[PDB]
Amino acid sequence: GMSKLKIGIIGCGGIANQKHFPALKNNADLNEIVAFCDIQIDRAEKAAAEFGAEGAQVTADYKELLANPEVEVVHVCTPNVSHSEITIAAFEAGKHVYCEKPMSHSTEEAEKMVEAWKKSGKQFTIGYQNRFREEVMNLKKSCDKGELGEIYYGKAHAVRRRAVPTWGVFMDKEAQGGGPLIDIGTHALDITLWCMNNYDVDSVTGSVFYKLGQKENGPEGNLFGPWDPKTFEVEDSAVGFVKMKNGATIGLEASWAINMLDSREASTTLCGTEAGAEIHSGMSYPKNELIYNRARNNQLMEETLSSVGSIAYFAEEGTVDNRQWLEAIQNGTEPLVKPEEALAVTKILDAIYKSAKTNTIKF
Amino acid sequence: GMSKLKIGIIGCGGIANQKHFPALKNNADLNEIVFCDIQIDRAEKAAAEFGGAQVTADYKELLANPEVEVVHVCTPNVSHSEITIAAFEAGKHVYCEKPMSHSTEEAEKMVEAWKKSGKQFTIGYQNRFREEVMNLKKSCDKGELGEIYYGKAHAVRRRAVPTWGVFMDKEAQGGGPLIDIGTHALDITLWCMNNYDVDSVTGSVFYKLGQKENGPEGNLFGPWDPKTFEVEDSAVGFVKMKNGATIGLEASWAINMLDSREASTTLCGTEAGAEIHSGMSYPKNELIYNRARNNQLMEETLSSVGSIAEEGTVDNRQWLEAIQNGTEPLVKPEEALAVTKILDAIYKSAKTNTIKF
Amino acid sequence: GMSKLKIGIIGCGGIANQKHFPALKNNADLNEIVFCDIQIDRAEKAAAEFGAEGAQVTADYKELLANPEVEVVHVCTPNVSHSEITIAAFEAGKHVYCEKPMSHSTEEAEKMVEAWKKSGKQFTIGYQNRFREEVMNLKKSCDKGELGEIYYGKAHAVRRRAVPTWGVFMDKEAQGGGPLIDIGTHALDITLWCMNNYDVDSVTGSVFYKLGQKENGPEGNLFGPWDPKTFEVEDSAVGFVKMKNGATIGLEASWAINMLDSREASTTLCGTEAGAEIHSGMSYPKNELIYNRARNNQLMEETLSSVGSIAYEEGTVDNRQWLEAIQNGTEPLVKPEEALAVTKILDAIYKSAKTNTIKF
């Protein structure tokens, strides 16, 4: 064995509760957390009564959770504009830090927290846990062996027909900075680049729509109940067009509300010189799908996942994301999600937003 | 009317936790348990939620327990004969698991030991009590297939080696997937045909993917150490019976076929045909009759039952009631002995020759 | 320009009018016929449709062979004559294309190879389903070892109820067997060909005479009724063929059996690295081919994609490949030695009317 890892958690809510806390508990052999911050201390204490170890810290404001020099790693499950604050310099006053999903809504703040990190000495990672799904790994591994050839056309799918989240921070334009483009669209673009392993941006064009978000009959049909139409501060959909310096191109579609039929998110579509591939996931897909396509021995074929069943008496990615995170600081290696990659992601989404000036942004 | 049978389970591992204990609890009105496993914490943990019952690590100490009236042996296959025979049939009714034993002659000793006892004996062939298997069984007993001359036994998994115990230890199991899941399919097949007159047996045993480095990739039950794969990964047989009927058999834990169909049978008759579908490629067990009717080819299948707002339990209940009321359990030991005889003859084609009966 | 090969047809029967005549007119630039059929009005009518000017129409094959103007002979008589019309004769000046099974007899077959080697001429057998695009796809992938070593295979030649009620197939005199040599030939040829294993060590089979003479057997037959009182041949058979490298091949063949899946001219292969199966027959409106393997710790399957929109066969592919190999002096795809192993094994399965495994 080897001691343990003393974890500090900042912000206890939606994805501290649905992803982060269960992830750590199912790897308790490597972690146990005292932490339990939040501006609202009511929740902070409750978590530390379920997942906090034998007598622990429970601060009401982070600045002194970071004081305790026995905590060694921090999980920033803030909202988005606090993502910079609680992380940049603040947390790396002597810690490794796991910041959540959209690294930051701003590119400058993101560039600040990568330099605060590069002097940290410690380690850093972002919550793109979808990389750890078995089929995304499968596709990533395939593109690493060049079995798709060289990818010259990619698509990032992050579409929802009417699945606007009405339960938390995602609609406060000030707390998260943007709408579905940086909510879910950041997941799909991360995989697309990661498999293509192309991060050298040249140009960016985009369009941001504000159409169903303010229509009276807008919330009609939304999965998560109605929402106040006269208070929609973000967008309902956005579409992107990014050209790389090797010539490759990526199209992006992101939305919470749009009258399209195929709700496909956390997915991508790659087109190489030897083969292609597409991943399927979202509201219209009860099971995640992976389909290669190529010409083999002069016939067009397609290779997909086979249906896995159970036996008489015998028979995930959030846990795999987190476990790999701890063993990373433990054995002293690199986590899978690299900080510079999440940086490339946010600066393009930002660039797609900044095409709110109706002009293509060259990099 | 009748007081609960007092049960002692030897072996508190996999099949004991997910088949026997829930079934015994479902039929709690006919039984109560008074626990054994050489990893004693397994026995203690089971004695905590299913049991002031005995909790030992020596099986010999449990058959000494005079309060035990029925013993269930759910330890690996090699162990089956020692625990069951000259030991358990010391005034104890015995329910022995799935693979009677690995050897035709430890099995022949077990039967002999059972008949001396004057007690009750049966084997864990719970797949018989699936309603569609019962369905097929009733239809050939009625002869609605005619004479059955071709029967297929399906016991194939594409990639599902059991990795939670000792299934890959020839010293403790005696064999691989041939006697692990091929016994279920052969049991059903011969039981429906009511034929046990073996003429000849030709078989093959494959060692290909168990030790392959890439073998464990895609396994339902996590990876397996290729170094310590001491038994086969597939085997097929060809059995001829004296009435002219022929039985094909396919068994495997790992093989690159597409159709994972296990605990299933296919029967071609002179008047009609039928086939059972079950396994990892089937989210629902299926039963399909086929025949010509009014000069047109037809097929009869189970209709989709839904809602409005299992077989182990059925098997366990009829077992305890056979003991209580002094009747016959459904799976006769003679039937399970013919099966392992045929399975050992399939193996015994390590001599590259058709064993003849 | 290469001078057209002068073809002589022996047996102007059903296979000539469905396979050989339209193929030879589809490659009419490489050939021209110059027709023998004991039922002389068949040859005379065949010559009026596909013949070339003064064509030789006679009823004795030994006369056609004495035509100096013929150099390639297709033998499309029944199996009982597949040999003598091909051995001694035919291999007495000419190249010969003998039809589907080489012979019902094993030794009849081993002697037409000897007459072909002592000939210096070309020789191929009408196993034309090797030329279906999906069958070569599989053939190409195993040649490249992409399945690994194939240690277990299955040959599928099953029909639920499709006893051929026309032609010659029900006449045991002219064929020597039923579905085991009518369609089990095709299935086993493909299976051996992809495994590339023609080294037998054991054959165990069983032959069933059940629905064929049963009164209600003909009920629901796809081609119509047949009289069970005259039925001379089996309705199904199953075999268990072991090879020397250790591999195993099960085989299923039938015109009539009470199973659900009518799969014929198909194969299934399980290799050390991957597997594959082909689907063809009367339960398959379009041929299928499915590779199966593990790719990055996940089970996957690779199948042909649906082609459509049309615009804006294996019979003639087999024939051109055959004609060309003669002009260029190449060798045809179907090797005579391969076809010999096929009806050896099939004979060894039949030859379990001894209820004994016949070792090799």
Ligand SMILES: NC(=O)c1ccc[n+]([C@@H]2O[C@H](COP(=O)([O-])OP(=O)(O)OC[C@H]3O[C@@H](n4cnc5c(N)ncnc54)[C@H](O)[C@@H]3O)[C@@H](O)[C@H]2O)c1
């Ligand atoms: N699939 C994913 O990985 C995923 C999903 C949803 C959200 N996220 C990301 O995770 C973060 C938000 O997730 P959420 O849905 O749980 O939001 P949330 O509002 O439900 O949880 C955040 C909590 O932190 C508290 N908070 C606000 N400011 C704080 C501060 N300075 N210090 C301490 N606590 C503060 C709030 O009270 C709130 O309860 C964001 O960075 C978001 O973009 C990721």
Ligand SMILES: NC(=O)c1ccc[n+]([C@@H]2O[C@H](COP(=O)([O-])OP(=O)(O)OC[C@H]3O[C@@H](n4cnc5c(N)ncnc54)[C@H](O)[C@@H]3O)[C@@H](O)[C@H]2O)c1
């Ligand atoms: N669908 C079915 O019917 C089904 C399923 C699984 C297993 N089985 C059969 O049931 C048997 C047990 O297999 P399993 O799945 O439970 O794997 P398992 O290894 O988990 O169960 C065996 C347990 O018995 C214990 N054991 C070994 N030797 C012992 C001894 N002398 N005394 C006491 N305990 C001993 C082991 O510690 C183990 O916990 C096997 O013979 C197997 O073939 C049947």
Ligand SMILES: NC(=O)c1ccc[n+]([C@@H]2O[C@H](COP(=O)([O-])OP(=O)(O)OC[C@H]3O[C@@H](n4cnc5c(N)ncnc54)[C@H](O)[C@@H]3O)[C@@H](O)[C@H]2O)c1
């Ligand atoms: N898919 C295939 O490759 C396929 C299909 C059917 C038949 N075949 C093969 O082709 C042969 C049978 O052909 P068929 O189905 O057209 O039978 P068929 O009865 O329709 O035609 C055979 C003709 O040969 C003639 N014949 C018989 N003996 C002769 C002799 N000594 N001399 C000259 N002519 C003679 C007969 O007159 C008859 O017209 C067999 O070798 C059979 O196995 C192959």
